[PDB]
Amino acid sequence: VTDPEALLLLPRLSIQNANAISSPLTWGFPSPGAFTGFVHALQRRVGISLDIELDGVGIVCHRFEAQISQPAGKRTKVFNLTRNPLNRDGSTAAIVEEGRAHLEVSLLLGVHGDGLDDHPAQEIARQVQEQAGAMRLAGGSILPWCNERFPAPNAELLMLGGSDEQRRKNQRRLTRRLLPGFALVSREALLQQHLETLRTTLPEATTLDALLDLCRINFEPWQVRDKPGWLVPIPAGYNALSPLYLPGEVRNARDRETPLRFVENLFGLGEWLSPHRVAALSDLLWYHHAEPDKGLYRWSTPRFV
Amino acid sequence: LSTASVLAFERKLDPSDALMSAGAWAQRDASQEWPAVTVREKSVRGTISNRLKTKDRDPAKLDASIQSPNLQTVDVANLPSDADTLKVRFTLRVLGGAGTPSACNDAAYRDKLLQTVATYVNDQGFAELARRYAHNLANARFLWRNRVGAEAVEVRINHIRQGEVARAWRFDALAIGLRDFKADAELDALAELIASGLSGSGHVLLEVVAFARIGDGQEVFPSQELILDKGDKKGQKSKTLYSVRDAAAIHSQKIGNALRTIDTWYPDEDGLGPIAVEPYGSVTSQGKAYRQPKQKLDFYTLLDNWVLRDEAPAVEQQHYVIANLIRGGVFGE
Amino acid sequence: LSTASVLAFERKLDPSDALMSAGAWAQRDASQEWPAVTVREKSVRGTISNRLKTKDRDPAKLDASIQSPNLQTVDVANLPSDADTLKVRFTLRVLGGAGTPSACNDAAYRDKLLQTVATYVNDQGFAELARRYAHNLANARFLWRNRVGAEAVEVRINHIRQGEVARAWRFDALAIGLRDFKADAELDALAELIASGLSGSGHVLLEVVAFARIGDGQEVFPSQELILDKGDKKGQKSKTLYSVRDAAAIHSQKIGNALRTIDTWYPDEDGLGPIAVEPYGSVTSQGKAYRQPKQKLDFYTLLDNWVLRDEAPAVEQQHYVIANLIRGGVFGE
RNA sequence: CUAAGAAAUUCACGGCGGGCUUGAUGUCCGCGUCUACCUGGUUCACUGCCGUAUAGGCAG
């Protein structure tokens, strides 16, 4: 929730073989938690060695093509799986199901540290890109450089200092390289507004999620209800049910040193936009805060409006 | 020292999806503006020629079933009629650091594992595995059925440090054998590059381009997608083909299958040939599972007997175990 | 020794899609810049010529039904009005290695199969099958209806080793019979080429070009595509034709049907003629299935009795079984 | 340290036979375009001259 001094931008990260399931109820473009957890992984691999601090992430999502199929003329979709090796015995196995995407996305970042005084901009951006080129971005690999290394130089922009003409100037210099993409934010105040509109009958929120992103055909005593934007249901956090456990209690943990709870996801509303609607690009990064006295987790972009 | 209940190794030697584009031979050095091979549909009127039983078989249904034509819609991919060369391009990263797991419960088991792998690397390098990987990049294993029946296959491999080319190799896939791993100077150079990559001594990104003379207007073989076949709605269409944005392609895990055919150390028969490295080393097409757990040559048995009990196996089985760690996977209970 | 539950043989003699381009006879040796035959639309008003049951056929219902519209839109392909020669070009690979399956469960059954096929090749060569294949390339079986009613049909066959021509053959399809397989010196040369190809002793790529005098502005016959009249609005077409990029064409499996008409060994009647090689040897147009499984001449019965039990059939039935292995298919359960 | 970590869909095929789309016709009436201008880009940091080595009487 701390405002960054710089906005590091990764130009064209093309994921091969992503994870297009992302939740038990929504389907397509993956969770914000992969894109924030990637940034915390960069914080665990770079930011302690270059004395910087990476907090948020800005989804731009230039391109998206899911490996789907629609045979038999039905208006529903199925998947395109892969094989597995043979049985333990040597006959065949069962078939689990897994989503898939050929994603391409650009990522804004946020820098807090003192490495700008110790190192120039091209050094910082070059080290961050040349560490992010060997990772896996959303459950799938990151495609390396090709003939399309021509947008591959990064950018970096100090946000506090300088005159306002350099702020709007270099800000519009940033938003001409995020130009075909569509940003993504979180808009739960709209969901509270629609709860207060549909509060005549029942104030339930999950049925509001079922009654936002759909084509409401309201007949005449037929009129399609006007959608006030390109809204989308996303997963937006965890709401842990179990009390917390000591480290050496639950068998089959990942490591026996950090505590555990059993969680479920928490469904929220989000919105795809053009990047030119945004007032300041620092009001776009995805943070996630917590209060583990209770089970209340969420990803958010606080102060967007 | 029990085994860790959670083990997971991220893969190294990460390939990409290979793209296919067709053109003319001896226009081969300018293979940069060649158009892609597209996947199209055609209909097929065949007859029913499978096996038919004798139990619950009314001969009216039998002779009514044989004497009638079958209709069906498939996907094919062919070269253009004025082109006789298939071009297959993909890239390959060599990551390195092939001993550290990504998830492990125990801390003593993980330190014992790192001492075992570091003992292996300090006793002998990655020269054997990178030599066999260099032989699988040398010929055209990743041209699965496209290689079969070709006049000349040429493989070009580039090493990339920047927006440049550091060193280029040009091979001949038909002269290099399919089953005989024979040494060469250039294969020792590229094996030093891959072996320098897996040890973590640098960054290795390779660009692999393959060329095959097939014929004018012949058929190429991309990889085939799943129609799930869950009960109802079999559908008019059959044999759908994988693709990218208006180009036929091969999956990445199939090229990754073609790169890791190392294992010439079966207990059963070393006369057939190297088939790829798996725990419970199995072949899905042949329906057989070599390297049974009733023997003592399985990956889990050798790994348990070599980490926990310090019973070092033979050297070639150690090459097998480290090959499974370069493969990566989900291990443990 | 039970049968393998999975068997699959990849095909040999792989053709391509034939292209049609029209021009003038005696401008025949320069047939390289001839324009293609395009597929166009025209409208057709139908009639009533179907059978009636005369259970709901009143004499007023006929006049009411020929008041009715039978309006329709079809595709035709014609020669240009100043050209009287059809040119049909395709290529053909001969792969070889016609005994090894691509998928098999058992290892003993596969070795017994390879000993059986190698016993067949060592007892007698591929001279018979390549002689009949040479006769089907000699005449113009692959001109299905385009051959019917023509003045002169000329077939030119080229052998290709590089960007060159090794040996060229020029035949006359009307002098060579449709049903009588008579020997010739040139057909023995080309049969030695194909028989040298199927045995795996080299690489064989052939270029086949066919020439037919039909007439000025007459109609050519490409292969017809699949459409399904379901419930949409305002109607649609009733006859589409297969095409490539702005040229009429024939499917590859129809030429492949025309090449493998070998079977003169029916139990029923050898007076009709050779119709193509199928398990449960059947004709879709005639609606009949020769070579019934109630007899002992089916492919599955002869293959089971000749691999598992060493009961060798007659020599011509062995030519039938090896012809089905050159065809390829999905065998087993 | 990312609903984390892993994965070969394969083999074969003939869409094809036949057809009459016809018949008839008025596109009509009317109109204000106008005032003003320095191409000299370099329509090539130049086009032909004692030395294939940078030295020049040039039409400049």
CSV table of C-alpha atoms in Angstrom, one decimal, chain B residues 67-208:
chain,number,residue,atom,x,y,z
B,67,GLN,CA,-21.5,-53.2,-47.7
B,68,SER,CA,-22.1,-49.5,-47.0
B,69,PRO,CA,-19.7,-46.6,-47.3
B,70,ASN,CA,-18.4,-44.5,-44.4
B,71,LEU,CA,-18.4,-40.7,-44.4
B,72,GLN,CA,-16.1,-38.6,-42.3
B,73,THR,CA,-14.2,-35.3,-42.2
B,74,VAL,CA,-10.5,-35.0,-41.5
B,75,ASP,CA,-7.7,-32.4,-41.4
B,76,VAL,CA,-4.7,-32.6,-43.6
B,77,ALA,CA,-1.6,-30.5,-44.0
B,78,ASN,CA,0.3,-30.6,-47.3
B,79,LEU,CA,3.1,-28.7,-48.9
B,80,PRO,CA,2.4,-26.3,-51.7
B,81,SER,CA,2.6,-27.9,-55.1
B,82,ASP,CA,5.7,-25.9,-56.1
B,83,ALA,CA,7.8,-26.6,-52.9
B,84,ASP,CA,9.6,-29.7,-51.8
B,85,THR,CA,11.3,-28.7,-48.5
B,86,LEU,CA,10.0,-28.7,-45.0
B,87,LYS,CA,11.4,-26.2,-42.5
B,88,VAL,CA,11.0,-26.8,-38.8
B,89,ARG,CA,12.1,-24.1,-36.3
B,90,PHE,CA,12.2,-24.1,-32.6
B,91,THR,CA,14.4,-22.7,-29.7
B,92,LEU,CA,15.9,-24.3,-26.6
B,93,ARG,CA,17.0,-23.0,-23.2
B,94,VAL,CA,19.5,-24.9,-21.1
B,95,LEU,CA,18.9,-23.8,-17.5
B,96,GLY,CA,21.3,-25.6,-15.2
B,97,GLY,CA,21.4,-26.3,-11.5
B,98,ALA,CA,20.0,-29.8,-11.9
B,99,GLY,CA,20.2,-30.9,-8.2
B,100,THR,CA,18.2,-28.5,-6.3
B,101,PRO,CA,14.5,-29.4,-5.9
B,102,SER,CA,11.7,-26.9,-5.8
B,103,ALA,CA,9.8,-28.4,-2.9
B,104,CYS,CA,11.0,-30.7,-0.1
B,105,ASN,CA,9.8,-31.4,3.4
B,106,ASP,CA,13.0,-32.6,5.1
B,107,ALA,CA,16.2,-30.5,5.4
B,108,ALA,CA,18.6,-33.4,6.1
B,109,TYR,CA,17.3,-35.3,3.1
B,110,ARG,CA,17.8,-32.3,0.9
B,111,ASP,CA,21.3,-31.7,2.1
B,112,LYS,CA,22.2,-35.3,1.6
B,113,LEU,CA,20.8,-35.1,-1.9
B,114,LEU,CA,22.8,-32.1,-2.7
B,115,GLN,CA,26.0,-33.8,-1.4
B,116,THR,CA,25.2,-36.8,-3.6
B,117,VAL,CA,24.6,-34.8,-6.8
B,118,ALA,CA,27.6,-32.6,-6.1
B,119,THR,CA,29.7,-35.7,-5.5
B,120,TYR,CA,28.5,-37.0,-8.9
B,121,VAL,CA,29.4,-33.7,-10.7
B,122,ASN,CA,32.8,-33.5,-8.9
B,123,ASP,CA,33.7,-37.1,-9.8
B,124,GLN,CA,32.7,-36.7,-13.5
B,125,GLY,CA,31.2,-34.0,-15.5
B,126,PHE,CA,28.1,-33.7,-17.6
B,127,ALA,CA,30.0,-34.8,-20.7
B,128,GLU,CA,28.2,-38.1,-21.3
B,129,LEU,CA,24.7,-36.7,-21.1
B,130,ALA,CA,25.6,-33.6,-23.1
B,131,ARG,CA,27.2,-35.9,-25.7
B,132,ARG,CA,24.0,-37.9,-26.1
B,133,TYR,CA,21.9,-34.7,-26.1
B,134,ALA,CA,24.2,-33.4,-28.8
B,135,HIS,CA,23.6,-36.5,-30.8
B,136,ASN,CA,19.9,-36.1,-30.5
B,137,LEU,CA,20.1,-32.5,-31.7
B,138,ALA,CA,22.6,-33.7,-34.4
B,139,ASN,CA,20.2,-36.0,-36.3
B,140,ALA,CA,16.5,-35.3,-36.6
B,141,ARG,CA,14.7,-37.3,-33.9
B,142,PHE,CA,12.4,-34.3,-33.4
B,143,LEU,CA,11.2,-34.9,-37.0
B,144,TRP,CA,9.2,-37.9,-36.0
B,145,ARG,CA,7.5,-39.2,-39.1
B,146,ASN,CA,8.7,-36.4,-41.4
B,147,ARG,CA,12.2,-37.8,-41.4
B,148,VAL,CA,11.0,-41.2,-42.7
B,149,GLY,CA,11.6,-41.4,-46.4
B,150,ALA,CA,13.5,-38.2,-47.2
B,151,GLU,CA,16.3,-37.4,-49.6
B,152,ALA,CA,18.4,-35.1,-47.5
B,153,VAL,CA,17.9,-33.7,-44.0
B,154,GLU,CA,20.1,-30.7,-42.9
B,155,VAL,CA,20.2,-29.3,-39.3
B,156,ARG,CA,21.4,-25.8,-38.5
B,157,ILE,CA,22.1,-24.9,-34.9
B,158,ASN,CA,22.8,-21.4,-33.6
B,159,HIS,CA,24.1,-20.1,-30.3
B,160,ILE,CA,22.7,-16.7,-29.2
B,161,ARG,CA,24.2,-14.3,-26.6
B,162,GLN,CA,22.6,-11.0,-27.7
B,163,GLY,CA,20.8,-9.9,-30.8
B,164,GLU,CA,23.6,-11.7,-32.6
B,165,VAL,CA,24.9,-15.2,-33.4
B,166,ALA,CA,27.9,-16.4,-31.5
B,167,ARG,CA,28.7,-19.7,-33.2
B,168,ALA,CA,26.8,-21.6,-35.9
B,169,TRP,CA,26.8,-25.4,-36.6
B,170,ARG,CA,25.7,-27.1,-39.8
B,171,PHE,CA,25.2,-30.8,-39.7
B,172,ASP,CA,23.9,-33.7,-41.9
B,173,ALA,CA,21.3,-35.8,-40.2
B,174,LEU,CA,21.4,-38.8,-42.5
B,175,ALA,CA,25.1,-39.4,-42.2
B,176,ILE,CA,24.9,-39.2,-38.4
B,177,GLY,CA,23.4,-42.5,-37.3
B,178,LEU,CA,20.1,-43.2,-35.5
B,179,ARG,CA,21.5,-45.8,-33.1
B,180,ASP,CA,25.3,-45.4,-33.0
B,181,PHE,CA,26.7,-42.7,-30.8
B,182,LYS,CA,30.0,-42.0,-32.6
B,183,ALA,CA,32.2,-39.0,-31.6
B,184,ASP,CA,33.0,-36.0,-33.7
B,185,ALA,CA,34.8,-32.7,-33.3
B,186,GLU,CA,31.8,-30.5,-33.8
B,187,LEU,CA,29.6,-32.7,-31.5
B,188,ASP,CA,32.3,-32.4,-28.9
B,189,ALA,CA,32.2,-28.6,-29.3
B,190,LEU,CA,28.4,-28.5,-28.9
B,191,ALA,CA,28.6,-31.0,-26.1
B,192,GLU,CA,31.0,-28.7,-24.4
B,193,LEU,CA,28.4,-25.9,-24.9
B,194,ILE,CA,25.5,-27.9,-23.4
B,195,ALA,CA,27.7,-29.4,-20.6
B,196,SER,CA,28.8,-25.8,-19.8
B,197,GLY,CA,25.1,-24.9,-19.7
B,198,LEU,CA,23.8,-27.6,-17.4
B,199,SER,CA,26.6,-27.0,-14.9
B,200,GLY,CA,25.5,-23.4,-14.3
B,201,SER,CA,28.6,-21.8,-15.8
B,202,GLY,CA,26.6,-19.6,-18.2
B,203,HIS,CA,23.4,-18.9,-20.2
B,204,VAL,CA,22.7,-21.2,-23.2
B,205,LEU,CA,20.0,-20.3,-25.7
B,206,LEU,CA,20.0,-22.3,-28.9
B,207,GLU,CA,18.1,-21.9,-32.2
B,208,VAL,CA,17.4,-25.1,-34.0
